[PDB]
């Protein structure tokens, strides 16, 4: 994954897821279953074993990483460019879609695609989360919680598609 | 618990259970829830935290213990005698009922009772399980599976009330 | 018645214690040478106180303590709350009677019950009586010997459970 | 066509380778011285093979290897199975086309897709072609250079996935 | 015055112481037985011484000690020197009165002050009185009971601080 | 101190302071010286040686403690009550004033006082700082920075005199 | 550085220186410133862271090294000869000046220069210090203090330019 | 061987055887011787030484291995195929007979044979034992005892020549 | 035983022885047875278981101990004196016979006896062996082999009854 | 011784011485022777053985102690006073003469004397050595070598009888 | 040386030777121276320174080695044959004389000689010692002491020139 351990891881585990069944298986037996997813849821348980876880974490897939203050998602990014990737929230998941073409060896022709979804552990706030893209094609998720903490309340809104710090 | 670790534990965780719610819581946020229980079933997722787991394990109450080949249940047995306790199967649980009277300090008069139920992690066979009583009043459950293993299939039948090896 | 018565028982216491030384120481015383022786015782017053022884005592059925600083009946209560018990003094003796519901294991459901009497000595101030759950999880029914000078009178009364612990 | 063509691419291859030485060685041649120168180549044949360168180439999207013992196109497949791919040779070039479902993270659901072409050299025996998942988790589409001596003819055919690995 | 016165215171011482034982031882014584018581014482013387218781015482405000070998009022002085204190005996009681400047933390400036009285028993020889800073950093104001024999008379005098420690 | 270591410590150282011278011385030679204080500032340087430183921391005096998110100040609080103590800001310091009278041994008469000042390390915000008092008489400083961080900008305002969490 | 440780270283631381412023730055915040130178111175413171320281140490530059009895300064001496270097005291520093020409590769023409100043720690006597040159172009500072020790008093005088022991 | 240780071884030783012688030787011385063988036986013783033882084990020969539940016999199987080997019981031993022809280097002509006998420890049942053959030509003995245990009673019967799990 | 171881031881074883048966037982089954013884022888085877061885060783009985160069036999020698014990060779054994009377507690009258035989391991020479008695009643066997070694040839002859080195 | 060683021682041785022878022785054988012584021486050678040486040282006797820069001689000084002891050099030894009378238990009458000689290791200068006496009656030798070192040349002169630092 | 140681050585130383111167130277110073030678011786012383021683040982030379029971001397034996070397006793030393011619590289003409003397540690008997020569030209000294031990008494006699065990 890486991140750390604890505590976170656990958370991661938781996120992862639961259912159981797965867881149951592982364990054993037982029973059953459961729871679932839704968102819220997340849861756890733890585981580891698964595978898924591984894938988540790492393986293939990619990778996940978890702290108290943030959960970070690092990708296994064979070349897509920063322009090909898109970020949005759906169903307590961070959604990613992409399409890229690349040159190789003894003449090929390549199309390359993916569509990813990643949950956040219960200490993570989905509404507050933001998600950004580095130059390798590597998404790395630093989404402000202003500092650390708890917020479980969440449900969807749109995230800015931004070039990344990490 | 003891037993072991692983594996078981886881199983244990598973078992435990888951538901878721618880788981858721723990877990966280888420969502839811669941599943349941039943049995079968069980589961888861794981856790631990719761408590329950613790209780379971251990504590109180008494105590639980788990292996692959058996699950063993050891009691916090302030004096009842071996005659006061009863063993049977009900709803993927080992049932125990008791009543005892004892002398103390600056004249009291005592009645003492309990009614216990314990699930088995599904790697345990409830139909094959047997349960026995030692001299301290301590139930300790060694119930033949002939050796180790899997049997999930179970539903109730009567267990012999036997004085124990452990 | 108381014283013477016481013684027876116481014785137981013584026885153991025885030785011586213790016683012485206590017482013172011484021684012787031778060688040886034885132881012682016373018545018035017584012683018781111481405690140681108580413890031881405890044993079972109990454990008891009662020093120079207070007079007490400790009862092994770790399955129960003090609220499932109600305490009354009748025919120069304390009667503590308890009946509690089934407590969850993630496995199943487990109750106890008791009907207890212990004689409080001529030395206890029964109008001071209170009902507490102690550090061991034993219910401490206490009428304090607030001063080490002897023989504050025993008499009948009913006690609703106000948490004393202590 | 193939051759021449191739160349352119191749160239680438050459360138680276260239140186020379380577071429020378291868071639051888030578140277121158111067210072320076340148370278170478061739045509016829071519160369391629070587592988180384491839590886470187890879660057992304891949990694390629193709030695004296065999000709191969490795593809970075760790998200996919070889069964989600179907391989056919068309207009003196290998076309590997893959589309897979979403794989579970305990978090969520993640797919990829690709539409790939790579040119196989005049030196590959295309009637020998097989489809395997390698040790790296890369799909190795191989027509063997069973003997080191040069230039077995390329031609079109469709390949159902029979697991080759290897 | 012283014585017675013383016582018242012482017572315281016683118371515691018371117891016783112581016382016884011382014384021685024883015781018673018764129961108781118381214581013782014485016156014259016384015782015182022882010491143981014191220691316891201490318681615071102080800690006090006074044995068979000497009679003492210990005072918790660790912020102060014995030179910031001046000691006088008035109306069969010792009056230790202290007022000190601010001591540096690398952070800032911190003072204390006190106006103290402590009755010395009929058994202290007050013409022997000395003023010391002890091992704990407590000011030990002592008139010795150089022999394990009873009741060397109390009377008024003013004491400039000559370092006694001891 | 504690807291932691680293880173914181350184811061702490620073804060411390320176011047130178012282330184120178130591140283040587040379030269010278220076420067111064003022506030702003702080510074430184460283140383150791011185012493112062020691004181601061701791010593005494009392005690200090430091983290990134807060600096905590724990006192050596022989009995003053929660009513006798006062909290305010002066010159990048937390000011404290107090007066208390207490019963002792073989009849004394006691007055007891203090006046404290404590700097904050520069990663601490003095304007945002609050400072609170527990039941032992122990001031413990938890002052919202909403979460962790930097703010050096500070100059004085009044802090609420509140009963404490820690 | 070386030387040683212690012691020285421381020283060284111282030285170184212171112023513061430076220281412051480292430291933181705060304041411032211162112182111165012168020388013386030285112173211281321590531281370481620055660068310066470284440078110082080381570176470049060069390197520093520190003991109680001497501070030694080792240089990153790409070829200068023993004749090109000069030693004197200025402003609690050892001064060094140089100019050398060297043959290289595919015809170059080289001039090479440096002008260094090095402080001594407070434990070091600048007036007593001497500084010498080995065959590699490496200055190494062994300057009699007759044995070990303290002398802080220093201000300038001329050092003999001697070929070195170390 | 391986196986284981124990227990077984022882067983083984035983088995072885024884014888012784042888043883013785060884032883020584012484014584012787023885025883033887037869069977039964076984035884033882133881041883160783022887040778034888060685052879056984191982050586050649081959190799042996022992557990409570089974004894496993692994062979040093330069190429015979699975068809060339035969399994039977004789005199508390597992019998094996074989004949194979193979191509080598600068033209040879090869015949290759063996005739083996292996005892079992007294914990092992010879009547219940079965013995199977893997693809390398490696006999590996897993013979049901249904689970673990004791049976020493044994005397011969025919074993199925089966392709192996291990 | 011782010785040584070886070687020885073885030886020882051886010785021882063887036878066877024883052885067978232880062883088982087877067968047877044876052878033886013788010786030679020884042887062885071885064882241880046885026882024886133881015883041887030781125881018672007594005790044994083994080396290459000698085998040493230490007794559990409740009071016999050095005069009551006898040493001779019979059937690759060291023979011991005894009778003693002793005063005790609230008037008894005592007779006390024993008759012992001890084999030597193979690497021991029985013809060369000597055996001696210490002040506690403890026989300790140091019998010259002029140094270490092998001699297995042995059959009986008389040993000097000597007071011992160990 | 112481010181230282070386160187020284050686030285020481040386010283021582030578021678041778012684030485031778121682130684052886051869041868022778121677140478021576012377011184120178020383030477040486160485041784131782022786014784011586022782013584030386120481023884016684007393005690010795060694370093590079000094050799220190500590005495087992049951009460002589500082006035009863004398220090001088004879034959690469430090000479000591004494006579004291002391009160004891159930009326005795005591005279107490000694006459000591102590060599110095080769690294020590006897002409430069000085030797001093502390309040316990404990001679402790700190004799200036201005700092550390070698001086072997020595033959006698008078040492000042001084009260000591150590 | 070787051987051884011781013882031886021482021885050785021784030986050686011584012377012274030477021684012285160484030583120183011183012174011276012475012684021577012778022987014886030885011685021683021781130483160583020376150278020587160385040478011784060783140276050239060769080498030495030491035990209680024998001292062994191993030579750095570039090719001499076993026929070229001679063994005798002179002045508590083992004497060795030799002359050999050997082919080399781009036509040389070689004569090669040595004359050695080796002391024995005092626990060695020179009269009982024997010394032997292995195939590499390596003298290795095993000289009967029938077993281990002490004999210091020695003065010269002739040793058999024997081919060696070690």
mmCIF file with all atom_site columns, C-alpha atoms in Angstrom, chain G residues 147-149, chain J residues 147-149:
data_model
loop_
_atom_site.group_PDB
_atom_site.id
_atom_site.type_symbol
_atom_site.label_atom_id
_atom_site.label_alt_id
_atom_site.label_comp_id
_atom_site.label_asym_id
_atom_site.label_entity_id
_atom_site.label_seq_id
_atom_site.pdbx_PDB_ins_code
_atom_site.Cartn_x
_atom_site.Cartn_y
_atom_site.Cartn_z
_atom_site.occupancy
_atom_site.B_iso_or_equiv
_atom_site.pdbx_formal_charge
_atom_site.auth_seq_id
_atom_site.auth_comp_id
_atom_site.auth_asym_id
_atom_site.auth_atom_id
_atom_site.pdbx_PDB_model_num
ATOM 1 C CA . UNK G 1 147 ? 53.685 20.700 37.223 1.00 0.00 ? 147 UNK G CA 1
ATOM 2 C CA . UNK G 1 148 ? 49.848 21.211 37.582 1.00 0.00 ? 148 UNK G CA 1
ATOM 3 C CA . UNK G 1 149 ? 47.724 24.058 39.023 1.00 0.00 ? 149 UNK G CA 1
ATOM 4 C CA . UNK J 2 147 ? 53.163 19.194 43.351 1.00 0.00 ? 147 UNK J CA 1
ATOM 5 C CA . UNK J 2 148 ? 53.855 15.591 42.073 1.00 0.00 ? 148 UNK J CA 1
ATOM 6 C CA . UNK J 2 149 ? 57.045 13.794 40.945 1.00 0.00 ? 149 UNK J CA 1
#
